[PDB]
Design a binder for this molecule. Structure first.
Ligand SMILES: CCCCCCCCOCCOCCOCCOCCO
Ligand SMILES: CCCCCCCCOCCOCCOCCOCCO
Ligand SMILES: CCCCCCCCOCCOCCOCCOCCO
Ligand SMILES: CCCCCCCCOCCOCCOCCOCCO
Ligand SMILES: CCCCCCCCOCCOCCOCCOCCO
Ligand SMILES: CCCCCCCCOCCOCCOCCOCCO
Ligand SMILES: CCCCCCCCOCCOCCOCCOCCO
Ligand SMILES: *SCC1=CC(C)(C)N(O)C1(C)C
Ligand SMILES: [Mg+2]
Ligand SMILES: [Mg+2]
Ligand SMILES: [Mg+2]
Ligand SMILES: [Mg+2]
Length: 549
């Protein structure tokens, strides 16, 4: 419903963000009965998730054809820690119980957040405003079991505590336990503070043990015209496979300001980040200490039928030095309800620890660089909200291994051309939400398709209510995809064919406190893989409930 904060770090109406923008709320996730973050994300425009099996296995996110490491995943506005040792976001381990909102903005945004924000940004928000206590649970195929307790209460005027415990367990598997607490205090009606803690202990079967904890603390000012935020953040994760141990601590501090001016806004902040890893983390001998500080400017202005939006950033990285990025967007509502939008942006990706200092390291690498153009038409027609975008993304200085000298070097190039189309509309009691993605992602030097990516995807959601039963059908076509066959050397490129997949979900309020839900995932039990060799789930049944007071 209308607001985002992820585009410039502060609240604005979505109609005011010129980049394509998806919002997923807790209500959606409960209806969809998602038992992981991937299942939430896989439903959205330009998202191509591949996974080495069912839930908990290593996964990669390809937003609009870009590399796994070319999406910025934020947790409550701060770069996901799990992402820091390898330089590529993998959310298979992150607990769905913590996801209260997802804001997903496509197109570049390094001009606000710095490194990784190339294909787009996915911000997972863990805060809810929803007082009262809840107990939920579920049971499903592969002996899935879930138990969950949460409460949000007032501790008098001005203060609130939120607490959550979640236990999720499956067999052949993947066990996950999660604890979250938060305190929110309002000093005046304009001034706020918060302290927020959470941690999860996961186990995945070769046997993996991931633990992570995050602590965030901040001050906010929310005036009639001025807005300010000061947030400090600390993450500690530890990742065992067995005796290999990857450990990282990530510290972040960021001060941002924004003022309403005219019909629009101007903003600015400063951003600092430190990452220390343990000796032997990322198959690198020594422990490292990496630092980054960035300063940026945002702006938004509406003049008559035109909207202009922009951001500009400079980052100083302890390893590669200085890199600047920028982006600008103009939109023209040429007739009421219809709008052309043109965007241009630059973005980048920092080298990772392995590329820099691993056995094959090159300590002098520069960032990977993206330039993107996009053009869109959006409209409201006869009750249909729609949008169609075409984009071009030239990526250069890709960090590639050279076999001859056994070192990483900047040299590869990629060209992505894509089309995004979306629509939502109702027909009597039925709500339809539909998207189509075309992605022609290639190596620009050799002109061959990049690997692991569906060239086409079609995604359709159908929701309705009949007798207090709330039903959701979800359909997805996963198009043809090229991959390597690793069972035989030299590794040949294989073609994986298109697949249709259907899910069926329902919910019923037994009483005003008690809702029961059931789901059949992959209803037609289709055999398929998103990584060659790795078998996905098959038809699965889940059954759950929630008791509120
Ligand atoms: C390739 C050319 C690069 C040129 C960069 C120019 C930067 C823009 O300068 C003009 C800024 O003017 C608009 C300011 O926006 C702030 C919004 O508030 C203004 C209220 O109407
Ligand atoms: C006082 C300037 C505040 C905004 C600067 C951030 C945007 C930097 O890139 C913009 C350069 O491209 C041309 C911009 O012209 C249109 C105005 O940009 C929208 C901000 O109102
Ligand atoms: C606040 C808005 C900032 C927008 C600025 C974007 C415009 C960038 O234009 C200059 C790009 O840099 C050119 C570098 O110089 C040419 C490279 O060749 C020199 C050899 O070292
Ligand atoms: C108030 C913060 C505004 C600072 C952000 C501006 C950075 C935008 O950089 C755009 C990239 O421009 C390319 C050229 O940058 C190279 C630096 O040149 C320095 C000496 O020429
Ligand atoms: C790719 C962008 C193309 C957008 C095409 C839209 C062109 C004009 O849109 C329709 C103009 O409005 C007519 C709407 O239908 C008649 C309703 O008239 C008002 C009701 O009294
Ligand atoms: C203005 C909205 C974009 C329209 C997209 C669909 C129309 C296709 O028209 C011709 C396509 O030309 C072939 C190239 O297709 C992929 C290009 O994607 C856009 C990047 O340049
Ligand atoms: C879609 C092209 C014509 C103008 C926009 C119509 C509204 C689109 O919304 C529905 C999107 O549904 C998927 C349609 O897929 C066909 C369009 O693909 C463009 C291929 O170049
Ligand atoms: S979208 C920015 C955002 C994330 C969260 C920390 C939940 N917030 O307080 C803001 C609005 C800074
Ligand atoms: Mg077990
Ligand atoms: Mg058991
Ligand atoms: Mg250099
Ligand atoms: Mg009652």
């Amino acid at each position: 419903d209308t607001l985002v904060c992820t585009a410039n770090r502060f609240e604005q109406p979505r109609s005011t963000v010129l980049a394509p923008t998806t919002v997923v709320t807790r209500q959606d996730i409960d209806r969809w009965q998602s038992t992981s973050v991937n299942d939430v994300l896989r439903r959205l425009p330009g998202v191509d998730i591949t996974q080495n099996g069912g839930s908990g296995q290593l996964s990669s996110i390809f937003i609009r054809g870009t590399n796994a490491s070319h999406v910025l995943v934020l947790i409550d506005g701060v770069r996901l820690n799990l992402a820091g040792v390898s330089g590529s976001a993998d959310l298979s381990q992150f607990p769905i119980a913590l996801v209260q909102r997802v804001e997903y903005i496509r197109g570049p945004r390094s001009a606000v957040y710095g490194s990784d924000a190339i294909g787009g940004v996915v911000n997972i928000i863990t805060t809810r405003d929803e007082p009262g206590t809840e107990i939920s649970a579920g049971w499903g195929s592969n002996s899935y079991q879930n138990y969950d307790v949460s409460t949000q209460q007032q501790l008098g005027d001005k203060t609130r505590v939120t607490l959550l415990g979640d236990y999720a367990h499956t067999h052949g598997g993947f066990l996950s336990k999660t604890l979250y607490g938060a305190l929110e205090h309002n000093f005046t009606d304009a001034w706020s503070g918060f302290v927020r803690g959470y941690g999860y202990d996961n186990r995945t079967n070769d046997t993996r043990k991931l633990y992570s904890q995050s602590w965030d603390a901040g001050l906010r000012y929310n005036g009639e015209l001025i807005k300010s935020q000061l947030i400090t953040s600390y993450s500690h994760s530890k990742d065992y496979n067995y005796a290999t141990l990857d450990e990282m601590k990530q510290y972040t501090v960021q001060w941002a300001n924004n003022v309403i001016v005219g019909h629009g806004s101007i903003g600015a902040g400063v951003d600092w980040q430190k990452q220390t890893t343990t000796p032997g983390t990322g198959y690198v001998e020594d422990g490292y200490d990496q630092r980054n500080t960035g300063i940026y400017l945002t702006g938004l202005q509406q003049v008559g039928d035109f909207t202009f939006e922009g951001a500009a950033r400079s980052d100083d990285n302890s390893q590669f030095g200085r890199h600047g990025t920028w982006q600008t967007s103009a939109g023209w509502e040429f007739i009421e309800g219809y709008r052309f939008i043109a965007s241009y942006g630059t973005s980048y990706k920092a080298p990772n620890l392995g590329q820099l200092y691993g056995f094959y390291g090159n300590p002098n690498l520069d960032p990977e660089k993206s330039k993107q153009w996009e053009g869109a038409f959006e409209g409201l027609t006869a009750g249909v909200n729609w949008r169609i975008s075409g984009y071009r993304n030239d990526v250069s200085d890709l960090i590639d291994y050279d076999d001859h000298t056994l070192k990483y070097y900047n040299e590869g190039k990629a060209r992505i051309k894509g089309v995004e189309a979306t629509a939502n509309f109702d027909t009597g009691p039925l709500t339809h939400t539909v998207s189509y993605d075309y992605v022609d992602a290639r190596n620009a030097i050799t002109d061959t398709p990049l690997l692991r990516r569906a060239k086409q995807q079609v995604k359709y959601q159908l929701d309705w209510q009949l007798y207090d039963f709330d039903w959701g059908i979800t359909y997805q076509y996963l198009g043809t995809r090229y991959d390597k066959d690793y069972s035989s050397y030299p590794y040949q490129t294989v073609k994986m064919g298109g697949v249709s997949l259907w899910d069926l979900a329902v919910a019923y309020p037994v009483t005003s406190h008690l809702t029961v839900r059931g789901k059949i995932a992959n209803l037609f039990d289709k055999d398929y893989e998103t990584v060659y060799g790795y078998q996905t789930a098959g038809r699965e049944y889940t059954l759950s409930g929630s008791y509120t007071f």
